[PDB]
Write a protein that binds this ligand. Structure first.
Ligand SMILES: *[C@@H]1O[C@H](CO)[C@@H](O[C@@H]2O[C@H](CO)[C@@H](O)[C@H](O)[C@H]2NC(C)=O)[C@H](O)[C@H]1NC(C)=O
Lengths: 35, 50, 49
């Protein structure tokens, strides 16, 4: 801490995991149609 | 004792070896001191900003 | 699980950023030709002009 700061990312890790889970479920149930 | 700086001081649980006077961690920034009267280790943190 | 050093790229990015910050903050202790590297001392030890 000498005048320098670190800002947190807007998306937390839980949300990123949720996106990955949604993508995986979509591709595992609907094929490529959901794209 | 001649070492000057601004911040907020709290109690600390570090254990100085009986001859050091202060401490630094990385890039040579002082973090702890020893008051020459009570002979206890105090911890320094910068005043808040943003 | 077993083999290590499989994630070299992300570790490299982190190390590069940390090293850049470290060298930047360490550069604060150089005279650059002046008489001292601390500003309070030169304030309190010498004539303003
Ligand atoms: C510095 O001198 C002061 C003046 O007496 C000491 O303060 C007292 O010291 C006695 C003996 O250790 C303690 O029982 C008291 O509680 C102290 N009073 C305080 C701190 O208000 C002090 O101990 C001396 N410093 C050192 C390192 O010996």
């Amino acid at each position: 801490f000498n005048g320098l700061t670190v800002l947190p990312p807007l998306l937390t890790d839980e949300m990123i995991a949720q996106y990955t889970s949604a993508l995986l479920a979509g591709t595992i149930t609907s094929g490529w149609t959901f794209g | 004792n001649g070492l000057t700086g601004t911040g907020v001081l709290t109690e600390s649980n570090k254990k100085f070896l009986p001859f050091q006077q202060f401490g630094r961690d990385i890039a040579d920034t002082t973090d702890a001191v020893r008051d020459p009267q009570t002979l206890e280790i105090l911890d320094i943190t910068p005043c808040s900003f943003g | 699980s077993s083999t290590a050093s499989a994630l070299g790229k992300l570790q490299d990015v982190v190390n590069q950023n940390a090293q850049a910050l470290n060298t930047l903050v360490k550069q604060l202790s150089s005279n650059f030709g002046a008489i001292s590297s601390v500003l309070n001392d030169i304030l309190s030890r010498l004539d303003p002009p």
